[PDB]
Amino acid sequence: ETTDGVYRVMTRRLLGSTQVGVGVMQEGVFHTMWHVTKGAALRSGEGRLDPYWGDVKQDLVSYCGPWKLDAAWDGLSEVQLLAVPPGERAKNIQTLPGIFKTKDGDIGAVALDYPAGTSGSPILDKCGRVIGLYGNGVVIKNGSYVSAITQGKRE
Amino acid sequence: VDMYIERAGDITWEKDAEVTGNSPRLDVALDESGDFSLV
Amino acid sequence: KXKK
Known part of the structure; x- marks a missing residue:
């Protein structure tokens, strides 16, 4: 369960x-x-x-x-989105993250575009650990998408 | 409204995977309701 | 996004 x-x-x-x-x-x-x-x-x-x-x-x-x-992107290595799109089987997509630069620091970000219901799909390091979730991002000038690698804090 | 979950697979790194996408370097802001926006 |  x-x-x-x-x-x-x-x-x-x-x-x-x-x-x-x-x-x-x-x-x-x-x-x-x-x-x-x-x-x-x-x-x-x-x-x-x-x-x-x-x-x-x-x-x-x-x-x-x-x-x-609790795993964190190392700021250097390629990652995989384990995308689970609506009506489609889970698939692994490898990419080198870019960066969201904010006043409070940098966050890795992946330039991969999937339907809204793919939100929450995990992003993985080479050990298979989940370094964040896909789906909170921005739309850039040409209409494509960039998602933060959103990770919580394990207290 | 029935909101429910269904298992969709194991979480595993795929060896010899398709590499795609660029690596954009963007200036963004995050507001208190969780919205990212381009600066 | 087919931003969320």
Whole structure:
């Protein structure tokens, strides 16, 4: 019910489902972006996952316990987006991040474009550790997209 | 509204992967509601 | 983005 892995986040009412995002189950905690769930509870099979920690400024939320993903981009190496697009199987895409330069420091950023419901897909280092989640970013002049590598703090 | 999760795979680095995308160097600001914007 |  909380087995480790990457998951789709779906919504359904009376008709079919829609994939609104993706997230990571690790160490019994589900990790996704705030804009995917708006910080609301999730169903997993017969069970309920309750929000535990989150921050709208970071655009992150964890379920069942505190944020567990602590790996950091090394600022140097290529990474992989494990993209889980709506209606498509999970695929690994390797890229060298660029940089979001902010007044509070630099953040790695990936220039990869996927549908909105791919939000929350994990970005990985060469050891397979999740160094952040995809989907909070900017649209540049030509209409293409750059996502921050958004990572929480493991307290 | 039923918001629910479904497993979609294992989290593994793929050896010999497709490398793509550029590496843009952008000046951005982040507001208190989580929006990034270009400066 | 098919910014979020």
